Amino acid sequence: SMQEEDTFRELRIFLRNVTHRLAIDKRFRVFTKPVDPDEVPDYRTVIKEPMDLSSVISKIDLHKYLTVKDYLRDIDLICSNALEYNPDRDPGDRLIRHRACALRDTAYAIIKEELDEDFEQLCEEIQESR
Ligand SMILES: O=C1C[C@@H]2c3ccccc3CN3[C@@H]2C[C@@H]2CNC[C@@]123
């Protein structure tokens, strides 16, 4: 229905606003763009599904996310890729892990405050009906 297409358009507006607030935070610059194959040729042999905030913006616009749960799976994949690729006691590795945990925690905190639980439940019930 028209009501249902309006629901998904509101979800896209909400997700684009959250994503741009993450992407301007100086701590999260390393998560804003795909890893350059050149600079890190080893990255794609270890990390089987790369994800970054620019790709997330592209996916919103392609209608890839019909719920906030499916959006948060890609934020979780950004964070878990960084934890897996940078696991050592080095200060460089510990700094990126600290930033990756802060990106995940910041995303979940914005959504907990600003998302209405009945709005997400409606998206989940339209998705289940298709
Ligand atoms: O989850 C929301 C969405 C909306 C909002 C937006 C930014 C910051 C806080 C809030 C709290 N509020 C309003 C409207 C909704 C009613 N009680 C929870 C609820």
Determine the structural domain holding residue 110 and report its residue range: 1-130
- What separation in Å is there between the alpha carbon of 17 and the centre of ligand 1? 15
- Assess whether the C-beta atom of 126 lies below 6 angstroms from ligand 1: no
**Residue 4: enclosing H or E segment and its boundaries?**
helix 2-23
The dihedral region occupied by 95, where left means phi > 0, alpha psi between -120 and 50, and beta the remainder, is alpha
Cβ of 39 closer than 6 Å to ligand 1, yes or no, is: no
Cβ burial of 63 (10 Å; 0-12, 13-18, 19+) is exposed
Resolution, expressed in angstroms to one decimal:
1.7
The total of structural domains in the chain comes to 1
Q: How many CB atoms lie within 10 A of CB 9?
A: 11
Pocket test for ligand 1, best of 14, 111, 114, 121 (most atoms within 8 A of CB): 114
Rounded to whole angstroms, the Cα distance separating 64 from 19 reads: 15
Closest CA to 124 of 40, 80, 84, 66: 66
- Closest by Cα among 2, 18, 26, 112 to 74: 18
| CATH number of the domain where residue 90 is located | 1.20.920.10
Gap between the Cα atoms of 8 and 4, Å rounded: 7
State which approach was used to obtain the coordinates: X-ray
- Side chain identity at residue 41, one-letter code: P
State how far the Cα of 39 lies from the Cα of 1, in Å rounded to an integer.
Answer: 48
- Where are the alpha helices (H) located in 24-116, listed in sequence order? 43-46, 53-61, 68-85, 91-114
User: Hey, what are 108's tokens?
Assistant: 């979940």
**What angle, 0 to 180 degrees and rounded to 10, lies between the N-to-C axes of helices 117-129 and 2-23?**
120
